[PDB]
Structures are given as structure tokens and as C-alpha cells.
Design a protein around this nucleic acid. Structure first.
Lengths: 139, 191, 68, 90, 141, 231, 75
RNA sequence: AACGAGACUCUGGCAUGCUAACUAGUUACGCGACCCCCGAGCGGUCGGCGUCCCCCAACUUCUUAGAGGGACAAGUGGCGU
RNA sequence: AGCGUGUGCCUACCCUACGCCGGCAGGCGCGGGUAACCCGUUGAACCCCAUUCGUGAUGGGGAUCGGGGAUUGCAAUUAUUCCCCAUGAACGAGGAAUUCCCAGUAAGUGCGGGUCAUAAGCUUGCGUUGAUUAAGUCCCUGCCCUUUGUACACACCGCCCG
């Protein structure tokens, strides 16, 4: 039964109706599996059926509950970003905005030209790691 | 029945060994029928001591192999209880007679070995013990179900019960009756 | 002309074990009684661990063992 | 499907195979000179001389000419050999 | 009957349902955002996990001499997969168990008794053995 | 290979061993059985002795008189039997012919010491008597197949002391199913009914008279003799 | 790896065949429904739970990791 | 004749024998208390569940560690001069 | 379930029950332990029982990487350690070769001790689950004893010829 629809497009990534609801949503960047099993329960809907069985009325509510998480009482610590830095607030970042945000912080750390941006620009490991026996592309 | 254990439901009476060659290394019912296959952990400290322990237990032992399954003999017994169950529904027999045929049909009749001459490979055909046949036949069919369920949706229980059918009635859709005939085909050539 | 006509499956039993042979001790010389003729006896090479009094399944008795 | 007039090869006929695996006891190979039926080559009957390398002889993904030494008609075991091959047959 | 006689997989699954009917257990707000232990990688599937765990709490107090918030966590803790590092054991959450035991105590099925631990009230012990026979009444022991 | 050629004054002779063997084989038929417990009774009692035999020192036996046809409008009506019945379950029972495998000495006839080798070389023991008593084995199996037994029982018995042909001891018992057993020992009765056919091909075209069919004592050939009658 | 086709919900022919495959097959497991039809396999799990409530199939054994179902237990 | 080997030391495996124990237990009641009739009976009692109560109770099987005993190719059947 | 370990020691430091606060890391208030006495009737993992996922580089795998929160210290940047959210790579059973192992043994699985202000993918011990295969041989590698040959004794990795 329930032949109504299948694969669909939502914001910035195409989501199949083939998979279960929570796991389907995870493909969108900035949303992990842990982040989705919360947001579905705040929306008060089943996670025990497929994503192709959601109606347009329902999924319209999903993105609102997602993109204003503080106002639907998901805690601050449970977000991606707490006080971004130089923006002054708690934030939740999703697919195509995530990349834009990410590229800024790279640029910033070469602007000041800390140790970080130099390691980034040289293409070497940022964190404390040995590079003597780690890597190869070359040999 | 009140003086001799079944298997928890499966008779060990009306079970035969239909060779005169391979009995006295296949036995299951002389008094060796028990409710479960398990031991206290005596199975070998003499060469003859291996033979005595049941065929059904030997099957459970050789089922757990390849790293992640070693030391999980209780998980292994789950697969065997489903096996007999599936064999009985699927064809309808005393499901031990299935297994006895499956062992006897998978044991080789002649085998090859190596012999060193001129620093080059030469091969020689030789015979095989009844105890060797049983050990080989238990090895071969257990490899089949292990192999099939490595990416199939089917569970190992289903795979194993299928593998005993195609062995018990030769049909060359099993990993065993194939590999049996490969050895004998070699043994004809170099002899 | 086509393929061959072959003898039927024979059965013969051990009377005595002789000693182990091969280049790693992997072969075993053995004396066997034909199990239909009680004065007939052939020597064989048998791979597996054997005791005495157990029965084999020979595909032929044309073959006979020596030492190598 | 079959590429040949008969489905099964005969005895002493020249055929072609394509290696799909390399065995301890020789080479188990598929035919592409008939159906995709199985045929087994044995190690002894590949050459009459020594063999140092082994992948500079037979290897996977090679058409190799061979002679069908024996066949079990009922079972479908096509015994095979590479020992008797001449370039004229190739 | 004593609770010893019956299966325990059956025990909890009727005891959890019992409580939720009677309006019992004032639950914490956080119950839909809670990993539930440090060694998990996900939230529970269950939407009534609080009711289930309070069952298992009260049962263990019947058997053993009773112990605090620390000991309950040690009973529940399991294995922690640290990824590339080898697995090790660790303890789970505390603040959940601290809400469980205080919620039970509000109903007076437990109470802070002497010798460093809460112990189950005679009213509590009555209610356990009452439903213990209900299990045998149901299926047939 | 060469049977005992000892004279009739010796324990190990053809006669004394056959005496030994036939003495024991029916003694153990009843030792298997509970004569102090309930018997199954046919409505027809034994016609070889009266019912004024109240001792119950008749053997446990009943005598099937059964039908066969060999073709050529032949009707065979021959006595067959069982020796014991064994309690089954679900109101069923298992009919058994009991016979007993004696031994005198292992090492004077190229045999196996069963005491040493019964458990390990169970099969080799039975293979002994397919080389030394193969006549008697299939004779017993023919009787069991004539009867249609559910289980073929045998008893392992040997001399208690190998120089004393009177004292013997039971060593074990093993139940085989006679027909799957016949599949194992390579015995088939399809052959057998052409034998009895071929003998009836002689006698029927002859007239009435005491005719003798025997086996020659030093050659392998049977015959049909026509004798002046009363000889 | 490979590509195998599967369906997460039923359409006409699958569903209609599902009712009539039952008396034709003695063994019924979710795995066997994966091959004879093109079905996800988790679909076949709950599909058999439905049938047992009608009594069109019979349970014969159950476990955490494997479950067996039979035709009607008739003969 | 000497050194090494062995012998030796430690450890494991065999004690309802011996020695003795609230910084070790068990059993037995005395129990009184809690619990459910859950079984005969009625809820008591008898039986079942653990905990407190336990002693000026009984014991040392379990736990603990000391003294001792036990295995030697000893017995039997083969084989070896 | 077991071998252990624990402040009163080095110079400033232990193991933790219980109560309260926090999603967690953690904080805070009280109490015991010189230890068959307190932590600890060590209420550990694999295993066992029931849901969910479905042959899909998938929810397998967790590398790389962004932001935030704690603890140790005189100081944590080239990220000490720990925690939360997000990011989601190689890898779908592995060439030529090669290691180790015979009974509570191999393998799977957890724990204590060691180093330690903070911190084991290491090492050393301990429990738990627990197979298959052999009862042999000198083929390879190597070792012991005798006999034999030697232009060798820096001993064949030696020596020596055009």
C-alpha cells in the first residue's frame, strides 16, 4: 500500500523516500542521526515509517522546528555552534551555509596568520600528529 | 526413551549407518545419544579418544571458525537446533539420517599427496582412513554455509540445511560434493 | 572405444600396520586382507591415521605399493 | 551461451578456455570455446620442463589453448590438459 | 509468590505498564534529548524508557541490601567502544538515576533507610509480590 | 582360509564348535527375554506340544505360515518365525530374530579378540565373520528377511576360558535393522528366489519319490538324485 | 558488490501473489520472500506477522535472530 | 672419582582424615519483625522468599593455612637377552 | 569472576561508599579504611533474552576536520587529558613472501599491577568463553654422536685459478 510518492527534493540535497525518516534526513549536512531523532520527537511524528509517507504539511513543519531550535526548546549545548565567534549567538548551520561558514574560519586563521592557517595552506595536519610515517600520496 | 536420551525431541533410534566401512567411527545411538551436544572438555589426549564423542557434537565444533566466532559454542548450538528443524519441515525425515547420508556422500574414496623427485612436483595417489573421511566430510560442508551467508540475506541456519540436502542426495549444488569429485578426478590422473 | 568399463567398489580391511613412509612420514604402509578372500593380501599406502581392523574403500586392487 | 556446434567437448579435441582462478592442483577454468561450463587443468600436465615463475606462465584473464583429455558426460567434469599443444593448433 | 519464582523478562514488562496506568512517577523534562549513558552512541528507540528502568530499579532493591545512586549506575554500565582505541568498561549517567529513585520515594515505594542506602518500603514489597502472581495468572507458570 | 581340521576328540573341531555354537544360540534367545512377564499370545497356540505343558519351558517362538509365488503357478507355503518381541512405544512393538555369535579362540583362525577391539573396531569384528562364517551370517539374515523382523539382534559371546569349551560369558548386544543391514552386507534376495526356482524346474517334471538334494562333501556343486524309494 | 532490486511497500502483483504463495510453499521465512519476490526483507518480516493473525500461516519456532513459519500445519 | 643431567625448590591436581577460627562461614533453632496465600489450611501453623535478630547454641563440609598421608612402573596381560 | 592495589609514603600526596547539583565531563557536603575489618557478598566484558536496520561503501568503518564545555599544573600554543554537537575518508579480505602455536592449549573477551601531578594502542600478571588438527618424520632449516676426506686453522663468510 501507500504508492503516493517516493524520491523528493528538500533544501539543498535530494532526499529519497526509500529510507526511514530519521536516517533519510541525515544526508543533509549539519544534521547527524543523533540530531534527527530529537527533531522528529519535537515535531511529534512517527519515525517508524518511510520518508515517502510524509505529507507536505508535515515536512513544512520539520524545517521550522529544525531552524529555530532554541524556540522549540532544544538545548543550546545540543547545537553545532555556541557563540560562533564574532557573531554573538548560538546558531545551527545546515547544508550550503555550513561550507560558507567553514571557509571563513580557514580564511580568518590565515588573516591573522596563526600557526593554524599556515598548516592549512601547506596541506599538513592541524592537530598534534606525526607526519613522518603518516601520509603518502609519493614514495 | 526413558533410559536413553533423544536430542530434546529427535529420536536416535531408527538411525542407521548404511556402510560397514565407516561405522565404528560414526556412532550416535549406542549409548552416545544425549540431550545436548557438549562435553566437560575431554575429547583428546589419545588418538583413539577423538572417535568416541558424537557426530552431532563434532559438527558443532567445526562450525565455529575464522576469528570472530571462536569461543562462542553456545551461539553455535542455536544454529544447529534451527538446522534440524528446517530439515524436517523442508523434506520430512528423521533429520539425522539426512546428516548421516550427507557425511557418507562427502567423504573421498581416494586422495593424492606429494612426493619429492628431481626437485619438481610429482604426485602419488593413496587411500584414506575412515577417520579421515569423517573429518574431511565434516570440514567441507561447514565451509559451504560459512561461504554462502557471507553476503546473503539468508541466515547461516537456512544455508546449512540446504547444504545437507544437496549432499544427502548428490546433485552437485553443494560445496562438498563438488570438491569431493575434484580430488578423485586428480587421483585418477596421477596414480 | 568410448570412455571405459570399470570394476565395482571394493572393500578390504587391515590385518596389520607395517610402518610409516613418505618424506615427512605422511604415508603409512599397511597390509590388508581382501575381505572376500582370506588368503589374499596386498600391501597399500594409506594417508590417514589408522589403527588396525578398520575397513577401507579401494577403487582398485590393480595398484600395489612398494616404497616410493 | 554456447559458441559451438556441440554443447559438450569430445576427447582429444583442441579447445580454448579463459582462466578465472588458479588452483593449488592446477587451474580451474571456464570455457569460452563452449558454454561457460567448468573444466579442470592439472599441474603435472602443463609442461615437460621446470617452472620457476608461475604467473609468467598461466595467469587469470588469458585465453589459453588446451586439449580435452577426458570428459564425464553425465556429471559434467571436463578434464583438461595443456601438455599436448602445438602452435599450429593455436 | 516471591519474585524469585517467575521469569524476570516478563516481570519488568508488566511492572512498567502497571505504573504508567496509575499516574505514578513524576518524570524529568529531559527524556527526549538524553543519550542515557556515556558509552552509548545514540538515544533509546523507546519512548517510555523511564517507566521501564524504574521497574528494574525496584526489583534489585528486593534482592540486595539496597544502595545509592552510584551503585545503580554500576549495575547498568556496559562496554564503551572508543573507536580505533580498544574497548573498555565505563559507567553511564547519574542524574537520571537520581531522578528515578527520588520519584519512587515520592510514592513511598522506597525510602532512605539506615546503612548508607535506600531500601524498599513494606508497601513496595507488598506491591511487587502482588503482581508477581499476576504473571503466573497470565500465561501459566 | 583353512578351517579347523581337528578330530572329533578335540574342543576346537568342526563338530565340537558346532555343538558349542548350537548349544549357546538358543540359551541366549530366552536370556534376552522376560518369561516371568506377560507374553503376547496368538489365538492359536503351539501345535508341536500340548497346552497341558503348563511349565512354560517351551521356547519363546511363534510360527508364521506364509504365502509366496515364484511364478510358473507355484505356491510356497513355508514355516518362518521370530524369537522375541521388544517393547516399543505408542502401542507398537519390535519383532526380533535373536541369534548369537560364539567364539573359541581368536588366534587359531585369524580372528579378532573382541574384548580388545569391540568399541574401536566394531566393524572389523563383523568383517571377521564375513571371511570365517560368511555362510552363517547371511543364513541368519535370510531367516530375518523371511520373517520381516523390525530389528536383527545379535549377542557377542566368547569362551570364559579358551581351553574350556563349556564356560562362556556375554560381552555385548547390538540391534541392527535387518533390511538396511542387508543393504550393508551386500545381500539381496532377488537372486535367492531364482535358486529355489531352478530346483523346482527339476523336481516338478519328475514323478513322485524320495529325491535327494545335497551338497558334495569335497566339491562345490549340488545335484538332484533319483533314488529307489525308501533308501 | 552488486545491485539487487527491492521494494519497501507492496504493489498489486506482489500482494496478490503473497496470499497464494502460502499454500504452495511449506517453508516460509523472510529471507525466502527476498528471492521469490523483490521485497526489501524488513517488509517481509511484518508481512508475515499480519498473516499469522489470520491463521494463514503457523509459527513453529521463533528467536531474536531467526524466525520460521509454516504453511498451515496440515498433512 | 668429580661437575652438568637427575636429585632439589616453588606451583597445580587427591582429603566429609588431623589441627582451629565473631578481621571466615555453615547449620540449627530461639526467634520476634516484613512479605504474598503463593501451596495443605484461613490469614495462624506447616512449607516457600531474603533481611534484621542472633546466642552464654552447635559444627568446621564450604572459606582460610598449618602439620601429615597419597603414585612407586605398584598390580595384571603382552614384549624385551 | 579472579590476580591485586589503596592516604598516615618524597617533601605533599590514596582508594572511595553515601547525600545534593549537572545531559556529560564534573562540582559540592559528609563518613570509613594501617586493610579476610573500609572501597568490594569486587552487582566486569564476551556470552544470554527481546525490538530496529536489510546486502546497500548501508545505520558497515571512524580516519580527517570545525565550534563549544570540563579536569591536572607555575605554564597546555605545534591542539596534555576528558566530554558534547557537527564533518564522514581509505577500506568490500588482501601479491612476492613470512610468523606463532599441541590442552583449559590456540583464538575471542574483560580486568589488576608497572610508568603516573594529568595520560596506554605498550609491557607484565590474572580470570571468563573455549575449538580444528597431530600421536609423525629428517624433505626443508638447524642441532647431537660416530666413520671418512681436506691444499682449511682469521677455521668454506673458508681457501684458491687463468
Amino acid at each position: 500500500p501507500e504508492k503516493f510518492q517516493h524520491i523528493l527534493r528538500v533544501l539543498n540535497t535530494n532526499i529519497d523516500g526509500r529510507r526511514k525518516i530519521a536516517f533519510a534526513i541525515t544526508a543533509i549536512k549539519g544534521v547527524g542521526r543523533r540530531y534527527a531523532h530529537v527533531v522528529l520527537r519535537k515535531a511529534d511524528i512517527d519515525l517508524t515509517k518511510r520518508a515517502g509517507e510524509l505529507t507536505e504539511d508535515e515536512v513544512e513543519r520539520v524545517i521550522t522546528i529544525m531552524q529555530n531550535p532554541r524556540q522549540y526548546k532544544i538545548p543550546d549545548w545540543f547545537l553545532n555552534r555556541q557563540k560562533d565567534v564574532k557573531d554573538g549567538k548560538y546558531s545551527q548551520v545546515l547544508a550550503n551555509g555550513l561550507d560558507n561558514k567553514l571557509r571563513e574560519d580557514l580564511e580568518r586563521l590565515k588573516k591573522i596568520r596563526a600557526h593554524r592557517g599556515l598548516r592549512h595552506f601547506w596541506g599538513l595536519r592541524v592537530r598534534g600528529q606525526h607526519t613522518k610515517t603518516t601520509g603518502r600520496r609519493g614514495r | 526413551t526413558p533410559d536413553i536420551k533423544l536430542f530434546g525431541k529427535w529420536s536416535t533410534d531408527d538411525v542407521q549407518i548404511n556402510d560397514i566401512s565407516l561405522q565404528d567411527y560414526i556412532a550416535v545411538k549406542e549409548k552416545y545419544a544425549k540431550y545436548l551436544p557438549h562435553s566437560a572438555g575431554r575429547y583428546a589426549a589419545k588418538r583413539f579418544r577423538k572417535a568416541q564423542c558424537p557426530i552431532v557434537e563434532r559438527l558443532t565444533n567445526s562450525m565455529m571458525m575464522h576469528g570472530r566466532n571462536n569461543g562462542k559454542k553456545l551461539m553455535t548450538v542455536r544454529i544447529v537446533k534451527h538446522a534440524f528443524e528446517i530439515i524436517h519441515l523442508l523434506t520430512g525425515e528423521n533429520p539425522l539420517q539426512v546428516l548421516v547420508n550427507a557425511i557418507i556422500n562427502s567423504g573421498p574414496r581416494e586422495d593424492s599427496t606429494r612426493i619429492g623427485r628431481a626437485g619438481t612436483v610429482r604426485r602419488q595417489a593413496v587411500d584414506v582412513s575412515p577417520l579421515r573421511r569423517v573429518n574431511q566430510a565434516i570440514w567441507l560442508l561447514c565451509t559451504g554455509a560459512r561461504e554462502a551467508a557471507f553476503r546473503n540475506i539468508k541466515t547461516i541456519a537456512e544455508c546449512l540445511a540446504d547444504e545437507l540436502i544437496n549432499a544427502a542426495k548428490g546433485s552437485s549444488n553443494s560445496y562438498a560434493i563438488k570438491k569431493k569429485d575434484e580430488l578423485e578426478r586428480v587421483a585418477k590422473s596421477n596414480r | 572405444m568410448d570412455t571405459s568399463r570399470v570394476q565395482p567398489i571394493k572393500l578390504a580391511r587391515v590385518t596389520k600396520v607395517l610402518g610409516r613412509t613418505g618424506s615427512q612420514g605422511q604415508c603409512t604402509q599397511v597390509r590388508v586382507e581382501f575381505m572376500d578372500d582370506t588368503s589374499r593380501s596386498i600391501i597399500r599406502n594409506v594417508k590417514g591415521p589408522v589403527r588396525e581392523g578398520d575397513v577401507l574403500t579401494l577403487l582398485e586392487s590393480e595398484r600395489e605399493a612398494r616404497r616410493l | 551461451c554456447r559458441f559451438y556446434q556441440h554443447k559438450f567437448p569430445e576427447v582429444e579435441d583442441v579447445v580454448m578456455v579463459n582462466v578465472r582462478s588458479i588452483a593449488e592442483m592446477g587451474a580451474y577454468v571456464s570455457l569460452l570455446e563452449y558454454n561457460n561450463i567448468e573444466g579442470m587443468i592439472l599441474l603435472s600436465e602443463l609442461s615437460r620442463r621446470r617452472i620457476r615463475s608461475i604467473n609468467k606462465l598461466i595467469r587469470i584473464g588469458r585465453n589459453e589453448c588446451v586439449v580435452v583429455i577426458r570428459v564425464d558426460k553425465e556429471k559434467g567434469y571436463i578434464d583438461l590438459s595443456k601438455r599436448r599443444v602445438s602452435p599450429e593448433e593455436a | 509468590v516471591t519474585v524469585k519464582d517467575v521469569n524476570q523478562q516478563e516481570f519488568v514488562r508488566a511492572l512498567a505498564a502497571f505504573l504508567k496506568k496509575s499516574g505514578k512517577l513524576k518524570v524529568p523534562e529531559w527524556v527526549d534529548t538524553v543519550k542515557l549513558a556515556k558509552h552509548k552512541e545514540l538515544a533509546p528507540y523507546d519512548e517510555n524508557w523511564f517507566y521501564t528502568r524504574a521497574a528494574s530499579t525496584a526489583r534489585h532493591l528486593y534482592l540486595r541490601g539496597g544502595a545509592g545512586v552510584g551503585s545503580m549506575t554500576k549495575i547498568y554500565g556496559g562496554r564503551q567502544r572508543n573507536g580505533v582505541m580498544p574497548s573498555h568498561f565505563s559507567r553511564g549517567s547519574k542524574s537520571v538515576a537520581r531522578r528515578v529513585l527520588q520519584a519512587l520515594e515520592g510514592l513511598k515505594m522506597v525510602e532512605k533507610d539506615q546503612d548508607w542506602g535506600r531500601k524498599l518500603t513494606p508497601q513496595g514489597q507488598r506491591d511487587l509480590d502482588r503482581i508477581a502472581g499476576q504473571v503466573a495468572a497470565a500465561k501459566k507458570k | 582360509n583353512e578351517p579347523p581340521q581337528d578330530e572329533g576328540n578335540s574342543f576346537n573341531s568342526p563338530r565340537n564348535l558346532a555343538m558349542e555354537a548350537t548349544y549357546i544360540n538358543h540359551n541366549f534367545s530366552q536370556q534376552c527375554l522376560r518369561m516371568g512377564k506377560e507374553r503376547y499370545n496368538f489365538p492359536n497356540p503351539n501345535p508341536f506340544v500340548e497346552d497341558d505343558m503348563d511349565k512354560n519351558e517351551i521356547a519363546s517362538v511363534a510360527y508364521r505360515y506364509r504365502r509366496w509365488k515364484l511364478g510358473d503357478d507355484i505356491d510356497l507355503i513355508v514355516r518362518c518365525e521370530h524369537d522375541g518381541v521388544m517393547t516399543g512405544a505408542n502401542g507398537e512393538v519390535s519383532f526380533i530374530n535373536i541369534k548369537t555369535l560364539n567364539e573359541w579362540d581368536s588366534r587359531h583362525c585369524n580372528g579378532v579378540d573382541w574384548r580388545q577391539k569391540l568399541d574401536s573396531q566394531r566393524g572389523a569384528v563383523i568383517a571377521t565373520e564375513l571371511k570365517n562364517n560368511s555362510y552363517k551370517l547371511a543364513r541368519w539374515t535370510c531367516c530375518a528377511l523371511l520373517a520381516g523382523s523390525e530389528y536383527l539382534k545379535l549377542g557377542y559371546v566368547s569362551r570364559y576360558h579358551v581351553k574350556d569349551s563349556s564356560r562362556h560369558v556375554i560381552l555385548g548386544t547390538q540391534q541392527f535393522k535387518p533390511n538396511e543391514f542387508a543393504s550393508q552386507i551386500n545381500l539381496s534376495v532377488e537372486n535367492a528366489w531364482g535358486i529355489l526356482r531352478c530346483v523346482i524346474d527339476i523336481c516338478m517334471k519328475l514323478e513322485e519319490g524320495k529325491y535327494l538334494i545335497l551338497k558334495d562333501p569335497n566339491k562345490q556343486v549340488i545335484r538332484v538324485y533319483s533314488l529307489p524309494d525308501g533308501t | 558488490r552488486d545491485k539487487l532490486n527491492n521494494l519497501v511497500l507492496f504493489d498489486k502483483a506482489t500482494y496478490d501473489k503473497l496470499c497464494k504463495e502460502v499454500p504452495n510453499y511449506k517453508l516460509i521465512t523472510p529471507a525466502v520472500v527476498s528471492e521469490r519476490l523483490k521485497i526489501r526483507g524488513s517488509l517481509a518480516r511484518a508481512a508475515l506477522q499480519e498473516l499469522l493473525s489470520k491463521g494463514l500461516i503457523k509459527l513453529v519456532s521463533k528467536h531474536r535472530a531467526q524466525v520460521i513459519y509454516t504453511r498451515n500445519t496440515k498433512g
